[PDB]
Amino acid sequence: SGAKFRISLGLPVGAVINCADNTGAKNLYIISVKGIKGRLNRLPAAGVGDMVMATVKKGKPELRKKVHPAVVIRQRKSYRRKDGVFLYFEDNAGVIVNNKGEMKGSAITGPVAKECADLWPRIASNAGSIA
Amino acid sequence: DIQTERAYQKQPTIFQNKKRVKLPRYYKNIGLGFKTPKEAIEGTYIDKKCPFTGNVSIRGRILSGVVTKMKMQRTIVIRRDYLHYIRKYNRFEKRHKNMSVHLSPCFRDVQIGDIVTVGECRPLSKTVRFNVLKVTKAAGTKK
């Protein structure tokens, strides 16, 4: 039902993004993006609303030293919405999620982009503000 | 000479600005049979925290003490050696509760070792609630 409508993506592999939820994690080390086929010497990048593979560097130790799936909810790179507005959220943020789309946490600090809400309806449930 | 502070220094009761042709002074007795010193009347100073020429009254308790420090301006530190009996070990313990009392410059020749009776009043600062009432001379040492 809901398509992607490709946006500007600027978070490659190796970026550390802050945790905007209540799982106790602080940052998320991006290790790979789920869904990218790849290209020779092209780093897999992620925009807002993509299921991404992350890893906690500092924070709660029971979440560290293992691999967690994540969904990016905020980004620094200005991307173009289909009506023609360029949006950025002064930070790069992501949440810890499983493969089905269920949050480990329960609350979201900061806004969530509009295209992140409709592909992931459960993320929009705990989002305090949209767009 | 005098009135080196920021505002005009005078007793709030007195008034000398009426039309003319020595400054008047107001004082008060303290009660409980303590006399009023001579220089608190004779002098030209003011002090709002003095129980003789200031807006403060001695009430509650009257105790005594011995002076040990005077390195402040217009107040001193006293020593209060009191004995407490211990019911278990039937002997006495040497304890003191030293605290500062406000010494007005009504008294001039105040030395170390002088027994000074002191009176409870309203709190004038963070921890002082006492003023010097009258000063007795030390054991000898007139010179």
Binding site: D83, V85, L87, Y88, E90, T109, G110, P111, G128 | -
Partner: protein, 63 residues
Amino acid sequence: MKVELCSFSGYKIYPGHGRRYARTDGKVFQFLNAKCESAFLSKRNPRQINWTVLYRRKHKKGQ
């Protein structure tokens, strides 16, 4: 078609132009170009900037 007023300068922003900015605590600011964008990100008060509409509402200029 919703033309909407710029957050820093105060000029009307047509739907095809401008830039959208939303800070972390949740409020959204609008910039017509990077000229207005660069000033707001560095804590510049528009009331001290001569060419904005709020300067003219503060100095009672024009009209």
